[PDB]
Scaffold this motif. Structure first.
Motif, PDB file in Angstrom:
ATOM      1  N   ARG D  40       0.509  -1.131   0.104  1.00  0.00           N
ATOM      2  CA  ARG D  40       0.004  -0.177  -0.037  1.00  0.00           C
ATOM      3  C   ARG D  40       0.815   1.639  -0.077  1.00  0.00           C
ATOM      4  O   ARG D  40       0.126   2.188  -0.208  1.00  0.00           O
TER       5      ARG D  40
ATOM      6  N   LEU F   3      -4.120  -5.118 -14.094  1.00  0.00           N
ATOM      7  CA  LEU F   3      -5.770  -5.249 -13.936  1.00  0.00           C
ATOM      8  C   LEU F   3      -6.182  -4.452 -15.728  1.00  0.00           C
ATOM      9  O   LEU F   3      -7.574  -5.061 -15.619  1.00  0.00           O
ATOM     10  N   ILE F  11     -14.172  -6.419 -21.699  1.00  0.00           N
ATOM     11  CA  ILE F  11     -14.939  -5.390 -22.742  1.00  0.00           C
ATOM     12  C   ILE F  11     -15.072  -6.369 -23.420  1.00  0.00           C
ATOM     13  O   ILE F  11     -16.450  -7.109 -24.689  1.00  0.00           O
TER      14      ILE F  11
ATOM     15  N   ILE G  73     -23.925  -0.303 -26.828  1.00  0.00           N
ATOM     16  CA  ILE G  73     -22.362   0.243 -26.568  1.00  0.00           C
ATOM     17  C   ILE G  73     -22.797   0.071 -24.280  1.00  0.00           C
ATOM     18  O   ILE G  73     -22.104   0.021 -23.655  1.00  0.00           O
ATOM     19  N   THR G  76     -22.882  -3.963 -23.514  1.00  0.00           N
ATOM     20  CA  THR G  76     -20.991  -3.425 -23.167  1.00  0.00           C
ATOM     21  C   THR G  76     -21.255  -3.048 -21.278  1.00  0.00           C
ATOM     22  O   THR G  76     -19.756  -3.449 -21.189  1.00  0.00           O
ATOM     23  N   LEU G  81     -19.211  -3.120 -16.310  1.00  0.00           N
ATOM     24  CA  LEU G  81     -18.950  -3.100 -14.458  1.00  0.00           C
ATOM     25  C   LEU G  81     -19.700  -3.835 -13.714  1.00  0.00           C
ATOM     26  O   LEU G  81     -18.471  -3.976 -13.222  1.00  0.00           O
ATOM     27  N   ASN G  97      -6.109  -6.217  -4.646  1.00  0.00           N
ATOM     28  CA  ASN G  97      -5.702  -5.586  -4.015  1.00  0.00           C
ATOM     29  C   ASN G  97      -6.214  -3.627  -4.198  1.00  0.00           C
ATOM     30  O   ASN G  97      -5.235  -3.412  -4.639  1.00  0.00           O
ATOM     31  N   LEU G  98      -6.202  -2.904  -3.582  1.00  0.00           N
ATOM     32  CA  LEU G  98      -6.664  -2.026  -3.849  1.00  0.00           C
ATOM     33  C   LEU G  98      -6.637  -0.689  -2.462  1.00  0.00           C
ATOM     34  O   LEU G  98      -7.533  -1.024  -1.518  1.00  0.00           O
ATOM     35  N   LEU G 100      -7.971   2.595  -2.643  1.00  0.00           N
ATOM     36  CA  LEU G 100      -9.007   3.119  -1.989  1.00  0.00           C
ATOM     37  C   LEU G 100      -9.939   2.564  -3.052  1.00  0.00           C
ATOM     38  O   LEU G 100     -11.060   2.574  -4.149  1.00  0.00           O
ATOM     39  N   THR G 108     -17.452   3.497 -10.155  1.00  0.00           N
ATOM     40  CA  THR G 108     -17.609   2.585 -10.914  1.00  0.00           C
ATOM     41  C   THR G 108     -19.666   1.780 -10.814  1.00  0.00           C
ATOM     42  O   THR G 108     -20.094   1.415 -11.757  1.00  0.00           O
TER      43      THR G 108
HETATM   44  C1  LIG Z   1     -18.024  -0.069 -23.309  1.00  0.00           C
HETATM   45  C2  LIG Z   1     -17.680   1.138 -23.006  1.00  0.00           C
HETATM   46  C3  LIG Z   1     -16.045   0.666 -21.765  1.00  0.00           C
HETATM   47  C4  LIG Z   1     -15.227   1.713 -21.579  1.00  0.00           C
HETATM   48  C5  LIG Z   1     -15.397   2.084 -19.786  1.00  0.00           C
HETATM   49  C6  LIG Z   1     -14.876   1.172 -18.872  1.00  0.00           C
HETATM   50  C7  LIG Z   1     -14.629   1.434 -17.463  1.00  0.00           C
HETATM   51  C8  LIG Z   1     -13.828   0.639 -16.932  1.00  0.00           C
HETATM   52  C9  LIG Z   1     -14.440   0.908 -15.017  1.00  0.00           C
HETATM   53  C10 LIG Z   1     -13.859   2.386 -14.818  1.00  0.00           C
HETATM   54  C11 LIG Z   1     -12.634   2.773 -13.776  1.00  0.00           C
HETATM   55  C12 LIG Z   1     -12.765   2.821 -12.639  1.00  0.00           C
HETATM   56  C13 LIG Z   1     -11.469   3.746 -12.541  1.00  0.00           C
HETATM   57  C14 LIG Z   1     -10.058   3.008 -12.024  1.00  0.00           C
HETATM   58  C15 LIG Z   1      -8.988   3.541 -11.140  1.00  0.00           C
HETATM   59  C16 LIG Z   1      -8.115   3.064 -11.090  1.00  0.00           C
HETATM   60  C17 LIG Z   1      -8.342   2.337  -9.194  1.00  0.00           C
HETATM   61  C18 LIG Z   1      -7.351   3.187  -8.110  1.00  0.00           C
HETATM   62  O1  LIG Z   1      -7.616   3.826  -7.352  1.00  0.00           O
HETATM   63  O2  LIG Z   1      -5.822   2.046  -7.930  1.00  0.00           O
HETATM   64  C19 LIG Z   1      -5.492   1.276  -8.889  1.00  0.00           C
HETATM   65  C20 LIG Z   1      -4.325   1.175  -8.898  1.00  0.00           C
HETATM   66  C21 LIG Z   1      -3.170   1.622  -8.411  1.00  0.00           C
HETATM   67  O3  LIG Z   1      -3.434   2.248  -7.360  1.00  0.00           O
HETATM   68  P1  LIG Z   1      -3.284   1.435  -5.580  1.00  0.00           P
HETATM   69  O4  LIG Z   1      -3.625   0.072  -5.530  1.00  0.00           O
HETATM   70  O5  LIG Z   1      -4.054   2.556  -4.237  1.00  0.00           O
HETATM   71  O6  LIG Z   1      -1.892   2.328  -5.066  1.00  0.00           O
HETATM   72  C22 LIG Z   1      -1.646   1.891  -3.889  1.00  0.00           C
HETATM   73  C23 LIG Z   1      -0.455   0.299  -5.253  1.00  0.00           C
HETATM   74  N1  LIG Z   1      -1.361  -1.136  -4.457  1.00  0.00           N
HETATM   75  O7  LIG Z   1      -3.532   0.475 -10.205  1.00  0.00           O
HETATM   76  C24 LIG Z   1      -3.012   1.057 -11.094  1.00  0.00           C
HETATM   77  O8  LIG Z   1      -2.262   1.403 -11.500  1.00  0.00           O
HETATM   78  C25 LIG Z   1      -4.081   0.844 -12.852  1.00  0.00           C
HETATM   79  C26 LIG Z   1      -4.712   2.208 -12.703  1.00  0.00           C
HETATM   80  C27 LIG Z   1      -5.402   2.054 -13.643  1.00  0.00           C
HETATM   81  C28 LIG Z   1      -6.570   0.872 -14.531  1.00  0.00           C
HETATM   82  C29 LIG Z   1      -7.479   1.402 -15.532  1.00  0.00           C
HETATM   83  C30 LIG Z   1      -8.288   0.791 -16.354  1.00  0.00           C
HETATM   84  C31 LIG Z   1      -8.824   0.893 -17.663  1.00  0.00           C
HETATM   85  C32 LIG Z   1      -8.984   0.046 -18.866  1.00  0.00           C
HETATM   86  C33 LIG Z   1      -9.026   0.865 -20.255  1.00  0.00           C
HETATM   87  C34 LIG Z   1     -10.381   1.454 -19.880  1.00  0.00           C
HETATM   88  C35 LIG Z   1     -10.429   1.564 -21.572  1.00  0.00           C
HETATM   89  C36 LIG Z   1     -11.160   0.167 -22.397  1.00  0.00           C
HETATM   90  C37 LIG Z   1     -10.448  -0.384 -24.008  1.00  0.00           C
HETATM   91  C38 LIG Z   1     -10.233   0.126 -25.346  1.00  0.00           C
HETATM   92  C39 LIG Z   1     -11.088  -0.459 -25.511  1.00  0.00           C
HETATM   93  C40 LIG Z   1     -12.128   0.293 -26.750  1.00  0.00           C
HETATM   94  C41 LIG Z   1     -13.554   0.551 -26.158  1.00  0.00           C
END
Ligand SMILES: CCCCCCCCCCCCCCCCCC(=O)OC[C@H](COP(=O)(O)OCCN)OC(=O)CCCCCCCCCCCCCCCCC
Ligand SMILES: CCCCCCCCCCCCCCCCCC(=O)OC[C@H](COP(=O)([O-])OCC(O)COP(=O)([O-])OC[C@@H](COC(=O)CCCCCCCCCCCCCCCCC)OC(=O)CCCCCCCCCCCCCCCCC)OC(=O)CCCCCCCCCCCCCCCCC
Ligand SMILES: CCCCCCCCCCCCCCCCCC(=O)OC[C@H](COP(=O)([O-])OCC[N+](C)(C)C)OC(=O)CCCCCCCCCCCCCCCCC
Ligand SMILES: CCCCCCCCCCCCCCCCCC(=O)OC[C@H](COP(=O)([O-])OCC[N+](C)(C)C)OC(=O)CCCCCCCCCCCCCCCCC
Ligand SMILES: CCCCCCCCCCCCCCCCCC(=O)OC[C@H](COP(=O)([O-])OCC[N+](C)(C)C)OC(=O)CCCCCCCCCCCCCCCCC
Ligand SMILES: CCCCCCCCCCCCCCCCCC(=O)OC[C@H](COP(=O)([O-])OCC[N+](C)(C)C)OC(=O)CCCCCCCCCCCCCCCCC
Ligand SMILES: CCCCCCCCCCCCCCCCCC(=O)OC[C@H](COP(=O)(O)OCCN)OC(=O)CCCCCCCCCCCCCCCCC
Ligand code: SF4
Ligand code: SF4
Ligand code: SF4
Lengths: 188, 178, 155, 67, 257, 115, 318, 52, 144, 56
Positions: D40, F3, F11, G73, G76, G81, G97-98, G100, G108
């Motif tokens: 963390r 992740l 997706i 979408i 999808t 989610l 694990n996170l 937050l 989400t």
């Molecule tokens: C059909 C449409 C779909 C498009 C929308 C999809 C929505 C997906 C759900 C939304 C995600 C919610 C927000 C996520 C933010 C990250 C959460 C976070 O804060 O933790 C990230 C974590 C690091 O954080 P932490 O663990 O607290 O730091 C200490 C180390 N352990 O570890 C990380 O650093 C990882 C952070 C990055 C993860 C982001 C995920 C992005 C996924 C790709 C979305 C785009 C889709 C790909 C393209 C396809 C075409 C559509």
């Protein structure tokens, strides 16, 4: 092989037919799924007089009742002997999506049909479904036709909403054939 | 005689015991819990459903369903072409054109129900002075087509040549009530 | 072998369509009361995988109960022409099959079959809730004996 | 009777234990019989990236026996 | 409810559309094992209301979803012509069994549930509670039933017994006329207003000497209540206008006729 | 990275499950089942006109509070400060003025569905 | 060896959800004195496969008046989610694990709305515009409270990491400190997860199949796959945040085994509701939740601030 | 969602059972009256069996 | 006890339908295992068990058989079976079956009862059973 | 009958009243089937005398 088997038979030779769930206007309408329309020679050199279904059907149904037609061949062609480039531009002005040609020879546009001909289902095109469109060339010479059978045929100018109103998008889903610039008809 | 249903409002200067009684109805919403326990009282019951084709529910001898033309115990089609069974059939469903049978007797050449008509009302089995037309206890005779519900006379005698073991028991059970 | 695989796929494709068929929240007359008594705890639809969904887009069969008037008729084929097309139909009643009473009236169509095509006909003025149930078990085998992939192989 | 519900539950009930008990045995297999060793803060990451540098590149091992 | 369709099917033949109550009294008597089953049905139905009346008449949601809906006042219901339950639910003491008892209701003791503040929950209670006072009347109609006849004792208006028309002539003739022509009512006109559960179910017969009638006409309680759907749906939105229709006891057969 | 291995999947689990829904039903789309519903009739108006909501004022009080909610969220860390007497007070001051702001609207008929 | 963990994380929730469609039809049935499915399988264990395999054969309606991009979408985006919320959900040791790990849920959780708005807005229809709008004033109602009912619990816990609560609950359930929070949380687990006694959005009887009516079978399942998948989260959290099962770290399968026993009740507790109570008319739900829960929330939000500082009970930031 | 003016168009179930009684005798019209209120059957028969 | 008397009363259901091949058959084919007194076994295989302790809908149930009149009723089970002497019984019209109160035969009634012929051959097609009610003319084969 | 006396008390309690006496699943208390045949009473006016229709 019908005349030599069952003489005194009626033989209708219709033109390329259009109507709801057809294979003629709903063919060119679905070229919009790709970039554009690959039609040959920029559409020219393909004269076409299509015919509506009910004109054919009302012709058949009246041919099975006359004392006439005890062997008389027929030809159900219809009016407004269109030209293909303007026949398609009418469709894509009716179906308001867009229209740009993409001309080809038969060297490739008959081979693309052999790619889509490799479909176990109802194919989108074939070797030959490309070539009917391009053989399609005729002038009416002597044959009886509809008007001496019971029907006064229908122009494509009128019954084209019903068969292309589906292929449109919202923002064109109501567009009033008052609008859309009727096609150029060639007599030759 | 009349009875008030929602009339109790009278400010009795509600004591603090009658407040929690109301202030714990609220803040624990318990009047609803008396509904959750009420539905919990029923999953532990025996569901009244019945396996239909293996357990076909209860009927009674007067259940009137698919028509049939009964027959005397010595052949002899029990109809005598009176025509007081289409003169009453309100749905206007029956056409019973008749002739002398060539025995000199008097029988139908035609009989009909359009079962897409035929309200299933019973006026024809209670009007028949001979107990020819009845309305049997069938209720599984659905059909995939419209023509199979135009029972004329051959689909309707032999139908009565089918259920007569099952009709007469019910007719014998009821000729005292009618 | 290919045919044997396709017969079983076409026997296996139908098991879903015939078990989980979702009829449609129709009404219009007395006859509809018996559908409720077929949703009742005596002759359960849900035990047969049969569920009321009140939209055609979610539907798989129309159950036509009641007099199909001339004013309701556009709203009956506007609705049959809103499902996907594995769509089936069931005509409960003698008002829907032929217009039993009201066959000769002026504001009644003389059959659901004038307008929508039908797979099965349930007779009875109020057909017993165990008589639609015989029909939507018979419609449940009328497309057990459909061969939609077989006649694709031999074609 | 109501006991016909238990199949729908006790088959749903052998379906949400897996993502809990599989999430550990899959960690221990990868992490060397230990737990995933979450980080963390920036200190617990330093110990890893230290322990990553006192061995082969996998970090779930060597300790005393060296000097 | 199906347990009561078996009290038609065991009485008439049809579960639902039982042509049983004719002008000539009643077509056919009861069988020996019927009232002994209504008793075994009526002793227990009063608890099933309690098993529902519990579930609804004390909630918030039901009591915050129907209350103050449809507050149609007293003197406007009559101007609109409700006459069934959408006026006694607003405090108008009125019923055609204490005021105009038509069949045996003179010698039938019961209470007419009335409710002030008529708002789709006060008439609900008037509707759940006349299920009780009718369940009270079954206790009477089962106990006292004289051993008499079942149809009118007049063979030109009510056809004879199915065995009496096989010994005797006249019974066979009247049978051959009742079920072909009818019985030639005299010319006249009436208005039988009856309290169906919706309300004043009316029939404006107009007779002629024929065996057919000359323009019946039916008063649908619901042809006047559904016209009250305009003023009661004032201030109220889409999610509780859907409740007004159920607090008119709507059936689209009686109306659309 | 770990992740992205979870979520590009989902997706695809959705995107692979949708392509096998449009290209494996055998459709028959012509004219009258594509057109909109309104319960068995042709819709009067165009489905895309001003709705004219009635909770317009509450949507804003939410729009202000989502900040205020966000403005609370650092409390689990704020208690780990050495003062814990300004964090005490200033947490009372924020929650109190909110309820004051909420009680004023509660009386001045804000969250009441104009009608 | 990570894909083999997702594979054992998403299969065992799409195969569970499927049998919640079944269990939501039998438990409701026996309350209605009516057996549910009994036939397609032994006791209805094989009905969702029919239902599932039925829906991926029917014509996905591409309506003539719509926006075919957002049309496709939203499902999808819904099935993505609510399935993707199981990622940090800590059966004892989570996939991810996170710190937050719960704001990940809240944020989400809110994007499950836009699958309901973009759908009904794309689909041209009055009965779907409403269901879109019926979520707007619903999210506006509870989302003020799914934070503070979730903050004030995590205020006498420290970090937002869901993993910490297993140590906060090492000797007691947080249901007893905060049953007021757990009450309003339960209802706020019930507005989110629009499946409810107050549905208001997929209203069959008002707004027939709202936000969902122009959608035919293919896209249609992705909401049921998402809605009944989301029913199990917001009960799975209550089995973490309020009902704390047994950690005892040498048999970690005791947590996951008691985690089962309570999540099914809270997933079977929602089933008594739908079979027991009607809806709130859509003006009460926002008069029931800004007036009754919102002040009562801010109070206990304030009480749990003056709970540790009054005494000593300061959560540590590990 | 608030309702300003509704306009019901009841009539989608009209059949014409005030005009068919005109052509059917008093016994041959009795079961029409079950159809009016298809929920309370006998109470209609009980009415028509008194006006007669 | 008591808690196990259900188990001791629910175990013979399994071990009361022959063995596995019988119990496995009744289950998927009828979806209920219950022990009841057999009173039937009609022609062409219908068993007609009975149990008066169950409620009024489940105290009389039939257990159909395969090999109907060439139709293979092992899964395609109808209710247009149950011929016209147990219909009076299974539907609870009467109190005694057709073994101790059998019906009267009348030398026309069928012996081989047919189910609902729905869409096969061996179904119904209407007539105009009328003798044609008109006669046109007879032209001769004799010119003039 | 399918009660086993430990669910009766639950079932009677969660609802809050006794329902093993007032259940809606009919077993034997009902009137049976095949009742004995009746002999309906002829009404009045079948008395062979002083029954001229002109009076009634
Ligand atoms: C059909 C449409 C779909 C498009 C929308 C999809 C929505 C997906 C759900 C939304 C995600 C919610 C927000 C996520 C933010 C990250 C959460 C976070 O804060 O933790 C990230 C974590 C690091 O954080 P932490 O663990 O607290 O730091 C200490 C180390 N352990 O570890 C990380 O650093 C990882 C952070 C990055 C993860 C982001 C995920 C992005 C996924 C790709 C979305 C785009 C889709 C790909 C393209 C396809 C075409 C559509
Ligand atoms: C498998 C189940 C299908 C097989 C059923 C069977 O064998 O025949 C009927 C057989 C006899 O029941 P019945 O005679 O038809 O009904 C009488 C009771 O009313 C049945 O319902 P009841 O609830 O009234 O009585 C059952 C009994 C408790 O019954 C139980 O066995 C509880 C389930 C425990 C697991 O009730 C109690 O005594 C209360 C105990 C509660 C403790 C918690 O069913 C049983 O009661 C046996 C119990 C089955 C246990 C199922 C557990 C396994 C679930 C499937 C996963 C594998
Ligand atoms: C074992 C199976 C469990 C059955 C429980 C379901 C309820 C049925 C009980 C019978 C009943 O209906 O009682 C009605 C009765 C209602 O009776 P009443 O409505 O007639 O009157 C109530 C009394 N006055 C009016 C004075 C207030 O319920 C009660 O009186 C007390 C219970 C209400 C409070 C319970 C709900 C709030 C508690 C929430 C905190 C968490 C609880 C623990 C949850 C565990 C999971 C985390
Ligand atoms: C996992 C998904 C698999 C679904 C198919 C499993 C078989 C379903 C079943 O039990 O019934 C099939 C059916 C039997 O069930 P049924 O639906 O025909 O009838 C059930 C009988 N009643 C109604 C009386 C209870 O068997 C078949 O004939 C289908 C053959 C195709 C299945 C694939 C075979 C390879
Ligand atoms: C359980 C969750 C997972 C969901 C996925 C379920 C997986 C199991 C699905 C297996 C079924 C696959 C075949 C279904 C296709 C049904 C559509 C159809 O009937 O097509 C008929 C058509 C028949 O075409 P046709 O020649 O009869 O003409 C078509 C047009 N008409 C009839 C109007 C003239 O084509 C097929 O044979 C379908 C084969 C699809 C195989 C692709 C793989
Ligand atoms: C650098 C690369 C980044 C992209 C650069 C811009 C080009 C990408 C295409 C954007 C324009 C497409 C368009 O016109 O959109 C309207 C179109 C309009 O389509 P429609 O919905 O109105 O329907 C059209 C119907 N047919 C197919 C018949 C014509 O809809 C969309 O595409 C909106 C989705 C936008 C995608 C971006 C968001 C990411 C996904 C969200 C999660
Ligand atoms: C020692 C000193 C310090 C102590 C400090 C602490 C002080 C004590 C704090 C006490 C708090 C009391 C409880 C707080 C929550 C109460 C919320 C509430 O009041 O709800 C009221 C609301 C009704 O509001 P209203 O509009 O006025 O309706 C009545 C109109 N006549 O009611 C409702 O409308 C809600 C109805 C919704 C019903 C939905 C059904 C819910 C299903 C229940 C699931 C059961 C399992 C429970 C699981 C819990 C989670 C683990
Ligand atoms: S009343 Fe009876 S005997 Fe006379 S024609 Fe009709 S069916 Fe035949
Ligand atoms: S039952 Fe009634 S409607 Fe049917 S044929 Fe007989 S008289 Fe006509
Ligand atoms: S057939 Fe009979 S029950 Fe059905 S709608 Fe017509 S009158 Fe009513």
């Amino acid at each position: 092989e019908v005349r030599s088997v069952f003489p005194e038979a009626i033989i209708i030779r219709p033109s390329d037919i259009f109507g709801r769930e057809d294979r003629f206007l709903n063919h060119f309408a679905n070229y919009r799924w790709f970039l554009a329309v690959p039609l040959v020679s920029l559409g020219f050199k393909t004269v076409k007089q299509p015919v509506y279904v009910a004109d054919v059907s009302k012709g058949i149904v009246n041919a099975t009742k006359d004392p006439d037609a005890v062997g008389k061949t027929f030809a159900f062609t219809g009016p407004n002997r269109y030209l293909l480039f303007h026949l398609v531009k009418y469709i894509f002005g009716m179906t308001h999506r867009t229209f740009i040609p993409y001309p080809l020879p038969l060297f490739v546009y008959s081979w693309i049909g052999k790619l889509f001909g490799l479909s176990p289902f109802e194919p989108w095109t074939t070797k030959d479904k490309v070539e009917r469109i391009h053989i399609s060339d005729v002038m009416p010479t002597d044959l009886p036709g509809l008007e001496d059978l019971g029907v006064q045929p229908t122009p494509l100018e009128l019954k084209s909403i019903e068969v292309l109103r589906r292929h449109r998008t919202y923002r064109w889903l109501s567009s009033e054939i008052e609008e859309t610039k009727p096609a150029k008809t060639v007599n030759y | 005689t009349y009875k008030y249903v929602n009339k109790k409002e009278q400010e009795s200067e509600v004591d603090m015991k009658s407040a929690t009684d109301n202030a714990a109805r609220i803040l624990m919403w318990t009047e609803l819990i008396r509904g959750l326990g009420m539905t919990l009282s029923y999953l532990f019951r025996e569901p009244a459903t019945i396996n239909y084709p293996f357990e076909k529910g209860p009927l009674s001898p007067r259940f009137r369903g698919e028509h049939a033309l009964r027959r005397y115990p010595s052949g002899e089609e029990r109809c005598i072409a009176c025509k007081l069974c289409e003169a009453i059939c309100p749905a206007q469903a029956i056409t019973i054109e008749a002739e002398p049978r060539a025995d000199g007797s008097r029988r139908t050449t035609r009989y009909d129900i359009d079962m897409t008509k035929c309200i299933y009302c019973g006026f024809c089995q209670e009007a028949c002075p001979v107990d020819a037309i009845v309305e049997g206890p069938n209720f599984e005779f659905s059909t995939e087509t419209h023509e199979e519900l135009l029972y004329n006379k051959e689909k309707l005698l032999n139908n009565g040549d089918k259920w007569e073991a099952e009709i007469a028991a019910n007719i014998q059970a009821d000729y005292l009530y009618r | 072998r290919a045919e044997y695989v396709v017969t079983k796929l076409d026997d296996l494709i139908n098991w879903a369509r015939r078990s989980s068929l979702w009829p449609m929240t129709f009404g219009l007359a007395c006859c509809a009361v018996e559908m409720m008594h077929m949703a009742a705890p005596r002759y359960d639809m849900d035990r047969f995988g049969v569920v009321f969904r009140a939209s055609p887009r979610q539907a798989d069969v129309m159950i036509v109960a009641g007099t199909l008037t001339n004013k309701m008729a556009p709203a009956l084929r506007k609705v049959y022409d809103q499902m996907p097309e594995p769509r089936y139909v069931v005509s409960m009643g003698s008002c829907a099959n032929g217009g039993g009473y009201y066959h000769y009236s002026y504001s009644v169509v003389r059959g659901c079959d004038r307008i929508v095509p039908v797979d099965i006909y349930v007779p009875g003025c109020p057909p017993t809730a165990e008589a639609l149930l015989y029909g939507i078990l018979q419609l449940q085998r009328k497309i057990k004996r459909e061969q939609k992939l077989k006649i694709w192989y031999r074609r | 009777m109501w006991f016909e519900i238990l199949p729908g539950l006790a088959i749903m009930g052998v379906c949400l234990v897996i993502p809990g008990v599989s999430t550990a045995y899959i960690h221990k297999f990868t992490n060397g019989g230990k737990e995933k060793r979450v980080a963390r803060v920036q200190y617990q990451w330093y110990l890893m990236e230290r322990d990553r540098r006192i061995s082969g590149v996998n970090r779930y091992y060597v300790s005393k026996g060296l000097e | 409810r199906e347990k009561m369709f078996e009290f038609y099917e065991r009485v008439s033949g049809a579960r639902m559309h039982a042509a049983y109550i004719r002008p000539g009294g009643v077509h056919q008597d009861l069988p020996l094992g019927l009232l002994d089953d209504i008793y075994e049905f009526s002793k227990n139905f009063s608890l099933r209301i309690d098993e529902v009346e519990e579930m609804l008449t004390n909630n918030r949601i039901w009591r915050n979803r129907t209350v103050d809906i449809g507050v149609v006042t007293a003197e406007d219901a009559l101007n609109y012509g409700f006459s069934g339950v959408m006026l006694r639910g607003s405090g108008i003491q009125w019923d055609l069994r204490k005021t105009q008892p038509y069949d045996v209701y003179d010698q039938v003791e019961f209470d007419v549930p009335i409710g002030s503040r008529g708002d789709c929950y006060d008439r609900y209670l008037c509707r759940v509670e006349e299920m009780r006072q009718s369940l009270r009347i079954i206790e009477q109609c089962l106990n006292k039933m004289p051993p008499g006849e079942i149809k009118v004792d007049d063979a030109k208006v009510s056809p004879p017994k199915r065995a009496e028309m096989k010994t005797s002539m006249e019974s066979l003739i009247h049978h051959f006329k009742l079920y072909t022509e009818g019985y030639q009512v005299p010319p006249g006109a009436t208005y039988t207003a009856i309290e169906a559960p919706k309300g004043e179910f009316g029939v404006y017969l107009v007779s002629d000497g024929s065996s057919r009638p000359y323009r019946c006409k039916i008063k649908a309680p619901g042809f006047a209540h559904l016209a009250g759907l305009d003023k009661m749906s004032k201030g109220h939105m889409l999610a509780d206008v859907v409740a007004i229709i159920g607090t008119q006891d709507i059936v689209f057969g009686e109306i659309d006729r | 990275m770990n992740l992205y291995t979870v979520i590009f999947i989902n997706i695809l689990l959705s995107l692979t499950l949708i392509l096998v829904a449009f290209w494996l039903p055998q459709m028959n789309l012509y004219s009258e089942k594509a057109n909109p519903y309104e319960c068995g009739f042709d819709p009067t108006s165009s489905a895309r006109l001003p709705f004219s909501m009635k909770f317009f004022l509450v949507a804003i009080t939410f729009l202000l509070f989502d900040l205020e909610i966000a403005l609370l969220l650092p409390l689990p860390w704020a208690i780990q400060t050495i003062k814990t007497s300004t964090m005490m007070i200033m947490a009372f001051i924020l929650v109190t003025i909110l309820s004051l702001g909420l009680a004023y609207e509660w009386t001045q008929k804000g969250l009441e569905w104009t009608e | 060896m990570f894909f083999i963990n997702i594979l054992t994380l998403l299969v065992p929730i799409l195969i569970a959800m499927a049998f919640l469609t079944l269990v939501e039809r039998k438990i409701l049935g026996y309350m209605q004195l009516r057996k549910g499915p009994n036939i397609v399988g032994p006791y209805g264990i094989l009905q969702p496969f029919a239902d599932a395999m039925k829906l991926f054969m029917k014509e996905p309606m591409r309506p003539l008046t719509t926006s075919m991009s957002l049309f496709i979408i939203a499902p999808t985006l819904s099935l993505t989610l609510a399935l993707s919320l199981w990622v940090p959900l800590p059966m004892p040791h989570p996939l991810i694990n996170l710190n937050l790990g719960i704001l990940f849920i809240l944020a989400t959780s809110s994007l499950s709305v836009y699958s309901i708005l973009w759908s009904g807005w794309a689909s041209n229809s009055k009965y779907s515009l409403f269901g879109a709008l019926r979520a707007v004033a619903q999210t506006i109602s509870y989302e003020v409270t799914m934070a503070i009912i979730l903050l004030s619990v995590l205020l006498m816990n420290g970090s937002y990491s869901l993993q910490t609560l297993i140590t906060t609950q090492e000797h007691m359930w947080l249901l007893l400190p905060a049953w007021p929070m757990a009450m309003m949380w339960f209802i706020s687990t019930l507005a989110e997860t629009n499946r409810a006694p107050f549905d208001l959005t997929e209203g069959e009887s008002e707004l027939v199949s709202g936000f969902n009516v122009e959608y035919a079978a293919g896209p249609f399942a992705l909401f049921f796959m998402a809605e009944y998948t989301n029913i199990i989260l917001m009960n799975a959290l209550t089995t973490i945040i309020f009902l704390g099962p047994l950690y005892y770290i040498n048999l970690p399968e005791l947590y996951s085994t008691n985690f089962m026993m309570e999540a099914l009740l809270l997933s079977s507790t929602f089933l008594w509701i739908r079979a027991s109570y009607p809806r709130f008319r859509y003006d009460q739900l926002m008069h029931l939740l800004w007036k009754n829960f919102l002040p009562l929330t801010l109070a206990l939000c304030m009480w749990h601030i003056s709970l540790p500082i009054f005494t000593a009970g300061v959560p540590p930031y590990m | 969602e608030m309702v300003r003016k509704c306009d019901p168009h009841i009539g989608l179930l009209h059949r014409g059972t005030e005009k068919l009684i005109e052509y059917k005798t008093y016994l041959q019209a009795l079961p029409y009256f079950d159809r009016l209120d298809y929920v309370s059957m006998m109470c209609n028969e009980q009415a028509y069996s008194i006006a007669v | 006890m008591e808690l196990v008397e259900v188990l001791k009363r629910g175990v013979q259901q399994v071990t009361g339908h022959g063995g596995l091949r019988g119990l496995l058959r009744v289950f998927f084919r009828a979806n209920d295992i219950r022990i009841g007194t057999l009173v039937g076994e009609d022609k062409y295989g219908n068993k007609y068990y009975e149990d008066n302790k169950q409620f009024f809908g489940r105290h009389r149930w039939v257990i159909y058989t395969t090999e109907m009149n060439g139709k293979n009723t092992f899964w395609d089970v109808d209710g247009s079976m149950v011929p016209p002497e147990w219909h009076r019984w299974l539907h609870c019209m009467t109190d005694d079956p057709p073994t101790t109160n059998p019906p009267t035969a009348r030398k026309f009634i069928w012996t081989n009862h047919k189910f609902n012929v729905s869409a096969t051959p061996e179904q119904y097609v209407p007539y105009s059973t009328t003798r044609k009610k008109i006669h046109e003319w007879v032209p001769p084969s004799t010119p003039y | 009958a399918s009660a086993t006396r430990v669910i009766q008390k639950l079932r009677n309690w969660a609802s809050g009243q006794d329902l093993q006496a007032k259940l809606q699943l009919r077993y034997q208390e009902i009137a049976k089937r095949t009742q004995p045949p009746p002999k309906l009473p002829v009404g009045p006016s079948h008395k062979l005398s002083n029954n001229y229709y002109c009076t009634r």
